[PDB]
Design a protein around this ligand. Structure first.
Ligand code: AUC
Ligand code: AUC
Ligand SMILES: [Zn+2]
Length: 256
């Protein structure tokens, strides 16, 4: 599996039949059809920077991992009744600076997208277990619009120099991912899935209404990592976004 012609999104079904499921992500959010739900509570994030652990190149992308052995960093509120433990944040981008998000809004594709993932620690024993359950994961997706440079990304960009090829990892500490969210946390939520294999339909999506910025040169930096192991010929991490999937009867609720 990858994002190329040969093993990209259009082929994934050949291997993960769930790819053609009824709860696949991302989806296009048609704002004229979302449903206002008055039961939705404000999302509340309480992250501890001491939980930041490492940054790693996984080939198709890079992940920032957190210690998830306790409830030091959690997500609460929104559609939830239990708290979700923060385990990772990562990005999605495309081959062009203009079109690279996963989710679309009124058929408009953004430049990139941030995913802040958490697992249901109230109901499950570990992410492994939680990852395939319907209520296992909660992911906040934040849409990024190409424009002004965002100084909040700097620590992440700097870290990149050290995880240039596949399989490299570097300590990454004292960092609060909440510094990356927009100022207002109004949102849309829908039942969905992982946006790449294994594609489990285990995610409760929290899409921020407000987007954050990023510049061309910042995106170019993501695009500069390599999918190859060190010493092999260079193959750039050109894009890692999946096309939107049919809603198939699902409802997108808005907290506003
Ligand atoms: C397992 Au179902 C729309
Ligand atoms: N986005 C997001 Au995930 C785990 N496993
Ligand atoms: Zn993602």
């Amino acid at each position: 599996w990858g994002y190329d012609d040969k093993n990209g999104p259009e082929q994934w079904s050949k291997l993960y039949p769930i790819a053609n499921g009824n709860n696949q992500s991302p989806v296009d959010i048609k704002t004229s059809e979302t449903k206002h739900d008055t039961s939705l509570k404000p999302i509340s994030v309480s992250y501890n920077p001491a939980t930041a652990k490492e940054i790693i190149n996984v080939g198709h992308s890079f992940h920032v991992n957190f210690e998830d052995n306790d409830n030091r960093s959690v997500l609460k509120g929104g559609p939830f009744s239990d708290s979700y433990r923060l385990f990772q944040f990562h990005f999605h981008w495309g081959s062009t600076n203009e079109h690279g998000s996963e989710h679309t809004v009124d058929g408009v594709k953004y430049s990139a997208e941030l995913h802040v993932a958490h697992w249901n620690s109230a109901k499950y024993s570990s992410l492994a277990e939680a990852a395939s359950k319907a209520d296992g994961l909660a992911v906040i997706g934040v849409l990024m619009k190409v424009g002004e440079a965002n100084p909040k990304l700097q620590k992440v960009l700097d870290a990149l120099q050290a995880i240039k090829t596949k399989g490299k990892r570097a300590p990454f500490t004292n960092f609060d991912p909440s510094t990356l969210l927009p100022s207002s946390l109004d949102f849309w939520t829908y039942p969905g899935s992982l946006t790449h294999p294994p594609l489990y339909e285990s995610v409760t999506w929290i899409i921020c209404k407000e987007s954050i910025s990023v510049s061309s040169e910042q995106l170019a930096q993501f695009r500069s990592l390599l999918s190859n192991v060190e010493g092999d010929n260079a193959v750039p991490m050109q894009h890692n976004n999946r096309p939107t999937q049919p809603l198939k009867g699902r409802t997108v609720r808005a907290s506003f």
